[PDB]
């Protein structure tokens, strides 16, 4: 139980997320990812998963797990998904067909919206080509929609590729801002470093019970020993292997 838990804040509990075109990523590795704090965070609008069950996530092992946090409009929450299309799915954040993870989204009209207009959030709408899986494009150069050379400012034939969100609390459902957090899971030849909470139980001795110690399973009783195990040694084995 002395193992350090991975900080699940700064991604869900963060004040203001990164822009949709400039989404940031936190590398979660060499820790114990306690997903129990997620199920009681907020009334999420969507909690879909792909490849990994939402329940078995607290016990499966993964080499590296990434978390991407961004805020999009309420009517475009169905766009962030493997195989889907739209503005966000093509020019802001594209998921591959082999995406393995979960998608989390919840309402944020009381956080990322102001009466004067929360124009700090930006989203990409114009680009020469669609985004690749897990690709980022932070370029803010004026997209030349027309064949005429564009000037240093916006014009009739060229507009800024990044448009601002006019988030206002007076809007109804669908137009309110929604914070979206995407979780990505992967495994490779590198050994796994995150397996989730192990959820140990109380110790029972002098009884015929099943014991489990860091993966070693068996059946037998436990009694206080008088041995002199070394500080680095963990398992005890006799002559009979």
């Amino acid at each position, epitope marked *: 139980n002395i193992t350090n838990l991975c900080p699940f804040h700064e991604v869900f509990n*963060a004040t203001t997320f990164a822009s949709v075109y400039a989404w940031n990523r936190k590398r979660i590795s060499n820790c114990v990812a306690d997903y129990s704090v997620i199920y009681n965070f907020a009334p999420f609008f969507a909690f879909k998963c792909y490849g990994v069950s939402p329940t078995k996530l607290n016990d499966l092992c993964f080499t590296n797990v990434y978390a991407d946090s961004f805020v999009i409009r309420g009517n475009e929450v169905s766009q962030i998904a493997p195989g889907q299309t739209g503005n966000i799915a093509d020019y802001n954040y594209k998921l591959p067909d082999d995406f393995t993870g979960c998608v989390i989204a919840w309402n944020s009209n009381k956080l990322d919206s102001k009466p004067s207009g929360n124009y700090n959030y930006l989203y990409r709408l114009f680009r020469k080509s669609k985004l690749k899986p897990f690709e980022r494009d932070i370029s803010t150069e004026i997209y030349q929609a027309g064949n005429r050379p564009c000037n240093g400012v916006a014009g009739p034939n060229c507009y800024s590729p990044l448009q601002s969100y006019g988030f206002r609390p007076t809007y109804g459902v669908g137009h309110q801002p929604y914070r979206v957090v995407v979780l990505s899971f992967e495994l490779l030849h590198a050994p796994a470093t995150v397996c989730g909470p192990k959820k140990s139980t109380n110790l029972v001795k002098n009884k015929c019970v099943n014991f489990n110690f860091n993966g070693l399973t068996g059946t037998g009783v436990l009694t206080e020993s008088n041995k002199k195990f070394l500080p680095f040694q963990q398992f005890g084995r006799d002559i009979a292997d």
Partner: antibody, heavy 121, light 109 residues
Framework: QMQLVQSGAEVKKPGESLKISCKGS????????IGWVRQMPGKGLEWMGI????????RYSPSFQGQVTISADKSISTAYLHWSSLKASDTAMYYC??????????????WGQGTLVTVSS | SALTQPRSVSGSLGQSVTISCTGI?????????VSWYQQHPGKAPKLMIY???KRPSGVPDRFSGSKSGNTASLTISGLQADDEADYYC?????????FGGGTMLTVLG
């Protein structure tokens, strides 16, 4: 301009659970987060919690999750303070703060004038 | 995390003074969640610095700041008579706000 004036000073014995109010005007007191800040004489500012008058959503500091509760009424644009099990060391100056359109939802854009709560025997 | 500030600082009218404050955290999406507040003696605190690259309306432009890792500082372009008050740094990156140990600015005369 937008104004946010609190109630007058009060003095009660420890354990009476007094109540302090605050009246705002000049803006829609529904779309702005409002909170309170406690400061004992000699120390710095201590934030207790905030509340969004648009709904029942409330957030409080870990050191003030159950020591103080904050409520608001959108129909009269009035915020309220309530304590439980007061002690002699609870006498301190209290300040209010609102979100405003200057910064984010957590940023305290404006402040009040302060209310002195004296708790002694 | 907890913010720290020097309890006593000194200056002079027309000169400049700096107030350091550490303990700023960083979150995914931004790292400029640093704000400062000025509290007159016996009065309510007043917002003077929030989002350091920006300033509130009605606040004099003599106030400024800078960011260097987890350390923030408050700089004043010129001290005056009304500047003799307390200053408190604040951080709001983790959806929570905390205040330092308080300061006390004095000017010669």
């Amino acid at each position: 301009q937008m104004q946010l004036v609190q109630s007058g000073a009060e003095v009660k014995k420890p354990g009476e659970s007094l109540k302090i109010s605050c009246k705002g005007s000049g803006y829609t007191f529904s779309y702005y987060w409002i909170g309170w800040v406690r400061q004992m004489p000699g120390k710095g500012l201590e934030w207790m919690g905030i509340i969004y008058p648009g709904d029942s959503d409330t957030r409080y500091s870990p050191s003030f999750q159950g020591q103080v509760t904050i409520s608001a009424d959108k129909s009269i644009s009035t915020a309220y303070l309530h304590w439980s099990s007061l002690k002699a060391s609870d006498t301190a100056m209290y300040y209010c703060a609102r979100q405003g359109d200057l910064g984010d939802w957590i940023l305290l854009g404006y402040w009040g004038q302060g209310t002195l709560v004296t708790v002694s025997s | 995390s907890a913010l720290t500030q020097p309890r006593s600082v000194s200056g002079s009218l027309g000169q400049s003074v700096t107030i350091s404050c550490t303990g700023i955290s960083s979150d995914v999406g931004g790292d400029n969640y640093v704000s400062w507040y000025q509290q007159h003696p016996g009065k309510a605190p007043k917002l003077m610095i929030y989002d350091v690259s920006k300033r509130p309306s009605g606040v004099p432009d003599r106030f400024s700041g800078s960011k260097s890792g987890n350390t923030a500082s408050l700089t004043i372009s010129g001290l005056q008579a009304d500047d003799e008050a307390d200053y408190y740094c604040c951080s709001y990156a983790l959806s929570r706000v905390v205040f330092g140990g308080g300061t006390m600015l004095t000017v010669l005369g």
